[PDB]
Design an enzyme around this catalytic site. Structure first.
Site, PDB file in Angstrom:
ATOM      1  N   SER A  37       0.798  -1.225   0.000  1.00 46.58           N
ATOM      2  CA  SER A  37       0.000   0.000   0.000  1.00 46.58           C
ATOM      3  C   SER A  37       0.835   1.282   0.000  1.00 46.58           C
ATOM      4  O   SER A  37       0.261   2.357  -0.203  1.00 46.58           O
ATOM      5  CB  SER A  37      -0.951   0.000   1.193  1.00 46.58           C
ATOM      6  N   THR A 184       1.135   3.542   5.236  1.00 48.17           N
ATOM      7  CA  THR A 184       1.474   2.192   5.647  1.00 48.17           C
ATOM      8  C   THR A 184       1.373   1.233   4.468  1.00 48.17           C
ATOM      9  O   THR A 184       0.767   1.531   3.440  1.00 48.17           O
ATOM     10  CB  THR A 184       0.541   1.719   6.759  1.00 48.17           C
ATOM     11  N   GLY A 185       1.971   0.060   4.642  1.00 59.11           N
ATOM     12  CA  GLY A 185       1.834  -1.027   3.695  1.00 59.11           C
ATOM     13  C   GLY A 185       1.972  -2.350   4.416  1.00 59.11           C
ATOM     14  O   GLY A 185       2.805  -2.472   5.317  1.00 59.11           O
TER      15      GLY A 185
END
Length: 250
Positions: A37, A184-185
């Site tokens: 993401s 974030t991811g």
């Protein structure tokens, strides 16, 4: 141990915008991993420049039956929500309107990581899965370099697209008046056969921060060798916000 050797690692890279120097580096920070993401940042940039994305609230699209999406994602989404909630189907609707050539043209021209959005050779999933594990990878140092360029407006797209991209990067407030702009991811590393290995989750938090006029740019990436109960992306974020004041003191 009949299992393979552990490939777990952690990187934390913080650099000063005003001096250009590293402030705090823990780990080699050169390993490449799917951006997950975090790719929504350069994807917002590509969308705003191409003209499919207009501003912070338009275009507003509605989830429709048949589209792969989590239960929380089945709502009306606009660019702000897309970024704040990491809405995967909105990303894929954006790349579907871009097309494969326009998409690979922008990623190459941005110099983002390995700039490989072709996907897995044989599955034609470049437009849907490349930033999740199928082809595109990027290191913490390359996350910091890209964000540094975005922050100054020096990326090779229109400066209005860069301004609009910064505007929908989610904002967080950390101790000592740090205003943090981060994304974030969360994801899984691939196993030898190319399938997601759920025992190797990873989490990202990348962005920039400001305090009393001073700016830092950062990237934090955790790659585990054991399953996790909670998504690592948000966990890495919460840990980074708690630590950023001591991290940025140097």
């Amino acid at each position: 141990s009949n299992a393979q050797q552990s490939q777990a690692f952690e990187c934390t890279l913080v650099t000063s915008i005003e001096t250009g120097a590293v402030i705090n580096q823990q780990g080699a920070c050169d390993q490449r991993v799917a951006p997950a993401s975090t790719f929504k940042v350069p994807l917002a940039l590509i969308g705003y420049d191409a003209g499919i994305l207009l501003d912070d609230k338009t275009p507003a699209w509605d989830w429709k039956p048949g589209t792969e999406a989590r239960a929380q994602d089945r709502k009306t989404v606009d660019p702000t929500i897309w970024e704040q909630d990491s809405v995967l189907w909105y990303s894929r609707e954006l790349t579907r309107r871009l097309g494969p050539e326009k998409f690979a043209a922008y990623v190459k021209r941005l110099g983002y990581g390995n700039a490989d959005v072709s996907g897995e050779p044989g599955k034609n999933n470049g437009l849907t899965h490349s930033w999740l594990g199928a082809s595109l990878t990027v290191s913490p140092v390359e996350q910091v370099g890209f964000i540094r360029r975005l922050l100054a407006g020096n990326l090779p797209v229109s400066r209005d697209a860069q301004a609009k991209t910064r505007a929908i990067v989610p904002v967080f407030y950390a101790p000592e008046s740090w205003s943090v702009h981060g994304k974030t991811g969360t994801g899984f590393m691939r196993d030898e056969k190319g399938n997601p290995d759920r025992s190797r989750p990873f989490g990202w938090f990348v962005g920039w921060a400001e305090r009393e006029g001073q700016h830092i740019v950062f990237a934090r990436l955790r790659v585990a060798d054991k399953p996790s109960s909670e998504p690592l992306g948000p966990a890495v974020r919460d840990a980074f916000l708690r630590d950023i004041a001591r991290l940025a003191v140097h």
